[PDB]
């Protein structure tokens, strides 16, 4: 089905300690493909996936140059929002931005996006019409006027509906063996008695790509989020991801308690029960 | 490929 390309940008200011940090990172689905960190040696955009080093010198030079302008808008934005919010200079403050685009299973344009946060809360985002802004506060409005008179949205729409989707597919078919794979979960179940009265059943799901998975626990008939302990989906660090879900069972009822696994690599949604 | 035209807030 769907694919996406998303770029995440983080700029954090360092009072008394000079220039802000800037990290940018490029994803296609849940695969990191490029990075730039203001701290690392090179001071270029560097590759992070094998299917992208086959881009030539002119890709690398350009990427590096735009990631610096990104760096520079951010560097200035730190002191602009310090200004807007009349904040003290002695405080470290965070700016994040992510833009990107979704495409469907024909690879044609679905959704495009561009949000901005200042200290971890929405500042202004591009609406889904790619025409109009959502300033979160009253300082933030000044940016909205600035961006409306600088025709920002129009340049962004052009990118999101064009260059963003044109490049996603270039990436998607360069890394055909990597990105268009779907990796089935290696399903698994453990049983550990806590005291003498209770026991914990744990549905494991390992070695899957992509990171979209849902595991729901369920007794007898209808389901349960009244006893679900779910961990956040975590990377194994080899491209695949991991998740568990658990329950506090009254003992003897483990026959009618059932686990439910949904994914993209699972044709029929699999169902296990402790045996 | 990054956006070409970022603007200050």
């Amino acid at each position, epitope marked *: 089905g769907s694919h996406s390309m998303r770029y995440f940008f983080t700029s954090v200011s360092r009072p008394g300690r000079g220039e802000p940090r800037f990290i940018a990172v490029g994803y296609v689905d849940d695969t990191q493909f490029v990075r730039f960190d203001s701290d690392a040696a090179s001071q270029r955009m560097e590759p992070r996936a094998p299917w992208i080093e086959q881009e030539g010198p002119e890709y690398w030079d*350009g990427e590096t*140059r735009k990631v*610096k*302008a990104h760096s520079q*808008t951010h560097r200035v934005d730190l002191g602009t929002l310090r200004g807007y919010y009349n904040q003290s200079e002695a405080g470290s403050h965070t700016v994040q931005r992510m833009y990107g685009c979704d495409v469907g299973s024909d690879w044609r344009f679905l959704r495009g996006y561009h949000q901005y946060a200042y200290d971890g809360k929405d500042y202004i985002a591009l609406k889904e019409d790619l025409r109009s802004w959502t300033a979160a506060d009253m300082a933030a409005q000044t940016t909205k006027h600035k961006w409306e008179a600088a*025709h920002v949205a129009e340049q962004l729409r*052009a990118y999101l509906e064009g*260059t963003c989707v044109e490049w996603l597919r270039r990436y998607l078919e360069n890394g055909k063996e990597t990105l268009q794979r779907t990796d089935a979960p290696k399903t698994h179940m453990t049983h550990h008695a806590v005291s003498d009265h209770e026991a914990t059943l744990r549905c494991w799901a390992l070695s899957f790509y992509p990171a979209e998975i849902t595991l729901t626990w369920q007794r007898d008939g209808e389901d349960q989020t009244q006893d679900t302990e779910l961990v956040e989906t975590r990377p194994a660090g080899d491209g695949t991801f991991q998740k568990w879900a658990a329950v506090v069972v009254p003992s003897g009822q483990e026959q009618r308690y059932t686990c439910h696994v949904q994914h993209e690599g699972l044709p029929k949604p699999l169902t296990l029960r402790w045996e | 490929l990054l956006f*070409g035209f*970022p603007v200050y807030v």
Partner: T-cell receptor
Amino acid sequence: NAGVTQTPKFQVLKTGQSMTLQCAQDMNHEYMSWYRQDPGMGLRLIHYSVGAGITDQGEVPNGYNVSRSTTEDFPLRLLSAAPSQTSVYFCASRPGLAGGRPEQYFGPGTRLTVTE
Amino acid sequence: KEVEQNSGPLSVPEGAIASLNCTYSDRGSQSFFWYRQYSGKSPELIMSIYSNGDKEDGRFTAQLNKASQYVSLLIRDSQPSDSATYLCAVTTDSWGKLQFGAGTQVVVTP
């Protein structure tokens, strides 16, 4: 309204002479650019500056020094004039990081003749 | 020769369409421009186009095909005051140098 102004329109220099062409820009742009233009190679980049304070060289840097103390003004000096500097010189301004539409604008030009 | 544009001169009479072409070589280019330079003066921007398809503005119509890397400009219904040379220019980003083509000279005969 102004756009991109540049004095002078026309200039004769002898060989060795110093002259500084001036250029200015109302519209609050960050990215300015001197460019010479000639019959054999169209436009060539001399020097450019992507903000106030900072400047870098182009494809024909050589012979021409540049500075940018303000956002507005980007003067090009030719320290020792040479007959190979006989051209039409074009100021050219571009918004850069400050805002509004990728469009680059152009000064009306300085025709310069350098004779021995 | 990063932006190869149409050679010249291109002679058309009044009423004719004077199609111009330019091809470019950086794949990751993002804005595309047509300028107009009457002999003796300065290039003047007439058409900016930013994404695939046609952009209309009176008598001009620019086209963009990023897939085959081609920017066009057709001048519907010519005046004799369209006699100039028309420079195609292409850029990658806010800070990447604007790449001018050489110029195609257009002569509208009366």
